[PDB]
Symmetry: C3
Subunit: 230 residues, 3 copies
Amino acid sequence: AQITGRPEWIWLALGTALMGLGTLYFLVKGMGVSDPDAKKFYAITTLVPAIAFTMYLSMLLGYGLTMVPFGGEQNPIYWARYADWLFTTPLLLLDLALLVDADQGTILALVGADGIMIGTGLVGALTKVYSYRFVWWAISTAAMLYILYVLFFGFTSKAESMRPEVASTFKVLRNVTVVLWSAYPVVWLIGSEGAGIVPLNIETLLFMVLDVSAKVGFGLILLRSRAIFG
Amino acid sequence: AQITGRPEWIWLALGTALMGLGTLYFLVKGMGVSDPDAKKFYAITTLVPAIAFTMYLSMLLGYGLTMVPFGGEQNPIYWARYADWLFTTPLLLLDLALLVDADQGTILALVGADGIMIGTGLVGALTKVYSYRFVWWAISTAAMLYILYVLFFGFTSKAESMRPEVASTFKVLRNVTVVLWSAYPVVWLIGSEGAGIVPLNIETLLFMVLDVSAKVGFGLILLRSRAIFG
Amino acid sequence: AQITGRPEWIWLALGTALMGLGTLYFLVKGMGVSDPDAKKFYAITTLVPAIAFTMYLSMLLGYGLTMVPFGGEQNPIYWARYADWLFTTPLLLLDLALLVDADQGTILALVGADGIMIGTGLVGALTKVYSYRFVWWAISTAAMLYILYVLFFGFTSKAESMRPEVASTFKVLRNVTVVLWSAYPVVWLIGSEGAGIVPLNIETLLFMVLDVSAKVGFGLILLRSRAIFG
Ligand SMILES: *C/C=C(C)/C=C/C=C(C)/C=C/C1=C(C)CCCC1(C)C
Ligand SMILES: *C/C=C(C)/C=C/C=C(C)/C=C/C1=C(C)CCCC1(C)C
Ligand SMILES: *C/C=C(C)/C=C/C=C(C)/C=C/C1=C(C)CCCC1(C)C
């Protein structure tokens, strides 16, 4: 065993306990419900932290870390996150979409949009030759800007519901979504092994807070909200 | 060529001939049908053995085998199965769901559930350091228990249909599902390279019987059954 | 940087500028539309070239190339294409299906069909030992023949619509689909590193023309067509 040495551990393990406990609680809240509309929402959320948990575990001890060398050294990146964020994200965006009640097409484009967002991101990470890395970085973030756009501009404009509650609750979700996410790109550029300005300890710290707050928080106000009645 | 040496070959090749021939027959049974409800079911099944076939081939000669070293040696695991079971399974569970006629949400959670079940399993396999291997092993099997639960408890409770036939046929499918699957976990722990108690020859034997019986058998009683009328 | 040496570059870079510019234009055409039926189609297309673009980039400079050694040497294959064609294709087939208006089941089988088509193809590429390579090659192409069959025979027979326009437009799409695709298999066998008869320069040339013409062309006549009204 070696779940020590690499300082980041404390941080990882933290994100872990939080994720697992979360999926567990939502797990309960869902139990038996004439909620099928909501039940749908529930299943989605529950799954989200679930994944984040498994991933975080691998990332902690064995899996998740490689040694992408760029610029002139051996960098330790945690690809694992690329996977977890990958599945977790299309699901999330889906949660919002349904909540507001969009349309296959709209959601469809949004899904593929994210897929390329993260996917490309990853490709950059492993890319080596830090210069090209940042290049791919540009592509990905661009995609991100597109999804955000459709979120407020598109969804809000639809966000009209007969129910003031549904309308408000959504607004909050779309907002928090915007802020937290934006952080993701920025942090990765200056931090992690790319610009190499922010140490790995703090880098893992920030990233972590982002995960728990986004998945667990978002999912919480959402389910607890009268949006998924019952 | 080297489709010899490794004794398991005879077993693999066996699973192969069985898989291919199967997908072929179902292939026929489906041909032209005002069955679209059933036609749906058909397409699903047919696909299932199809995949199992391709995979089994790779696994036989070239692809499918690595050398995950743990405990203190070089172990020969057939990751290929991890892939085949991966796609095949979400499909299967889907076949049941529709047959009984559930609801997006329910099926949704079940899908992600399996995904994590197998996925995590794999991660364990490659993990190295046999101790941690078993750890991931625990996580996966847990997920399995969850899916089974929803199957009988949840589906059976719904399994109510106006048609006694549909109700019974299902019952049988859910049952065989339970038994065969349970075998999968157990066998992998004591057998394969983890506990290293069951030789690879017999390990490949048992696993094989499990595949053919599950995919081909399940699919057979199902289609042949009046459930997918026409 | 090394976006030179390997001659193919000029060709790759070409496919690139074409892909990106394409996704950009369709991007516009879609903008704001009471078209949701069509809007659906739009989103699909747009996504298609988008992917092709990102992939083509990686393939150009860093990602996309390995060194699968078979026959008796070190061969340079561009796996990247395997990925791009992978996602792009199920989407395309979906575009056709909806246009004509099929049924979940039919489309479903078609989707899994393609998945295995390309997937297996790839497996062959990396396979090593050129003999076995061609073997997998046979499997894949077979699958291809199946999809084509359902396309004209199945879809055309359904292609009946009340709208002569919809009926014709489709016909054209299914046709071009047939020809271009057939090229794909042939070229890869004689060309690329397998038979080693067609040089890599020309091999990249032909493959390229195939991509741009198929994705961009198909998508063009389609959207511009009154099929996706609005
Ligand atoms: C915990 C999972 C969440 C909600 C995922 C967040 C991450 C993003 C969608 C951000 C993606 C990135 C970019 C925009 C470009 C650079 C690389 C990434 C992956 C950090
Ligand atoms: C032929 C394909 C089938 C129906 C797949 C069966 C396998 C399972 C879903 C079992 C999964 C496992 C665990 C529960 C934990 C240990 C590792 C696995 C993959 C054997
Ligand atoms: C640009 C993307 C498109 C539409 C993809 C085209 C490729 C095919 C579906 C062809 C597949 C192949 C075979 C039939 C067997 C040999 C290997 C492939 C991948 C070239």
